[PDB]
Amino acid sequence: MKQKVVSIGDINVANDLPFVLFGGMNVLESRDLAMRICEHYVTVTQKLGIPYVFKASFDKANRSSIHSYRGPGLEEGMKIFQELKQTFGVKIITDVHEPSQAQPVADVVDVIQLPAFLARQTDLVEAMAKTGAVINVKKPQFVSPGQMGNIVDKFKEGGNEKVILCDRGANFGYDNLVVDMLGFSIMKKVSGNSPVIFDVTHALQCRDPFGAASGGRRAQVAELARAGMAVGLAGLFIEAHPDPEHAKCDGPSALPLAKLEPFLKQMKAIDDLVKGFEELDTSK
Template structure:
């Protein structure tokens, strides 16, 4: 099992359970920083390595008019400020090869969205930056198929790989998490992440936007940690009802600490088997 070093954070075998968390999309510097600061305070208390996440552009929206974020240039400026203020690594999505060079100057982790996980040119460009690449498993792929995605990064000369489970399509507007996917993907030799909030998303379930079932995040999180994951990915907000994107599946920041305490307790039990 490879251990991936991301700034001061190590993810992989023998390392503490890590957290990648923040708002779905950048909602301005002030609010994004407020959320990040609150998460850092919680993770510091609990001793959890923390990576801030927020998207500068949510290109895959149900509606043309849906809020996408501030865009590449402004978004990276905001992420750089948050990185400097919080002194934590940063992860965000990239959607095309023209974004890779600029994004790699700021981001510590380049994230490949689930729908783009088979895009060879994007994977190759991300790999060649030398940065850690977090590949989200497509809702249309089996866990075994992710070995091909990881191989594309490796064959481009980069072993800094994370693989993220975010649910598989189950009929229309619904996702399920196959717990077998964690040991299967982990067998490839790379750390595995569970995206606890996108996994309860109901894609397109609200017509012009996705719906979600936030009430199931805690149950799936406990299950994934019990099976054995190396990190958790969560979208967190101070008031998801006001969120400009993915509000129905985001975790309230004031509920996060209790959820993470449960995860740590379970992880302690299963750690000897990881």
């Protein structure tokens, strides 16, 4: 069949419609810190005719505590969207954490998210259901692709239907992740041909590192982000920062802000012909 299409503005994501770019950075460090990041992405998109949605997060939840750089916080967090927002009128995306706030957030932003850890959590699947917006599903590293119909079905069961599926790799042995480029279709099928998007950033982090033959970071984001692209996805997901990030030079992994352009050009040419190629198959 053809692929379902959740429409994010003049941007329409679809497994046959060009790899939409879902850029951003990690923890929302500073109202203007971001600009460097918005502005610099914004450009490259249009220069290369890649669509753009901006990824941004406002809270802690994950890692260091009691406050340990807990993120801008809701109240003053949402404010900062509205600036990058109109400054270039942009489609943004924020992960929520606990139900209540599944309405505030769902205002200044375009593509709300449901963090891996509360994936199969129901009451947030609902608290967003009581919204009807564009949701992004963070596919847990412990779930078989085949289990994505049990996050989607129920979303629709929540009234909300406008769903998206994001893959962050899956775990492989203690502390390490991997991706099976063969898990993208399986997710397509089990999930009403919903768009399938690759979080190239979180994904390979524990991947680059498999201690011994690694033990000091190092990066290969495009190298892996081209695999996604040559299988045929809806689009990518990446986070950047000048010198890597404050929340990615220690958190997970990231991408050099101004190295970003020829990355996409790799991802545009590669995608280019793949989204071209007239549908084939080898089950006969």
